[PDB]
Every structure is written in structure tokens, then in C-alpha cells.
Design a protein around this ligand. Structure first.
Ligand SMILES: [Cl-]
Length: 123
């Protein structure tokens, strides 16, 4: 699995079993493990290793987990930023995943927001 870490706040993305999504600095939490899988030829899904839930950014900017494979709001594009950092962009809504200093996770279209930078790393 891989971990998805906010560069700015050092928080890892987590999908909780209740479907909520937040950030944590608890490296020991198995819920921070993700599988990145292909969706068609040019996109990915971000799936919780432990719960099987997919990350979703909803049109209203909320971010949650779902097991509804038919919802196109689970599709992402990973875009290299540098150096080693990437942005995680919802294809359906054009929003970037963001972890806020308070541990909340949401979406934004502000590409210059520093809280949208992630580093993907092997666990
Ligand atoms: Cl905050």
C-alpha cells in the first residue's frame, strides 16, 4: 500500500469505516493505507486498503468514502507538482483534495492553495 501525506501539515489521509474522511499524524493507523488503481486508461481510484472504500469529492466540496463503484466522483488524476509532490484532482468536479490544519479534508479549485500538495509514499 501507499500513504497519502499532506506536505504542508504532514497529515495522512484516512478513510474511516463510518465513511468520513480526515487527516491524521498517527502513522500507526492502518486506515491511512491506500491502494491506487487504474480506472480506464488515464485516471485512478484511491481505495482504502482496510475498508475497501473509495475516496470521493462531492460537488459541494465535501470528501467522503463510498463503495458505490458507479459514482464518477471517485475518479482522480494525479498531477506531478515537484519535487516529488503531486496534486490529487477530481475529474468530475475539477476540485483538488485538501487537508486542512484542523484535520478536516475537503475539495478546492484553488490550485495555488498550499494545502493541496501531497507526497505519495510506499508504506
Ligand atoms: Cl483549519
Amino acid at each position: 500500500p501507499v500513504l497519502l501525506k499532506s506536505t504542508e501539515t504532514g497529515q495522512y489521509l484516512r478513510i474511516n469505516p463510518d465513511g468520513t474522511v480526515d487527516g491524521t499524524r498517527d502513522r500507526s493507523d492502518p486506515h491511512i493505507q491506500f491502494q491506487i488503481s487504474p480506472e480506464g486508461n488515464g485516471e485512478v481510484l484511491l481505495k482504502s486498503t482496510e475498508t475497501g472504500q473509495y475516496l470521493r469529492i462531492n460537488p459541494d466540496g465535501t470528501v467522503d468514502g463510498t463503495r458505490d463503484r458507479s459514482d464518477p466522483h471517485i475518479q482522480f488524476q494525479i498531477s506531478p507538482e515537484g519535487n516529488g509532490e503531486v496534486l490529487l484532482k477530481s475529474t468530475e468536479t475539477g476540485q483538488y483534495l485538501r487537508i486542512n490544519p484542523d484535520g478536516t479534508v475537503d475539495g478546492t479549485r484553488d490550485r495555488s492553495d498550499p494545502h493541496i500538495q501531497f507526497q505519495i509514499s510506499p508504506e
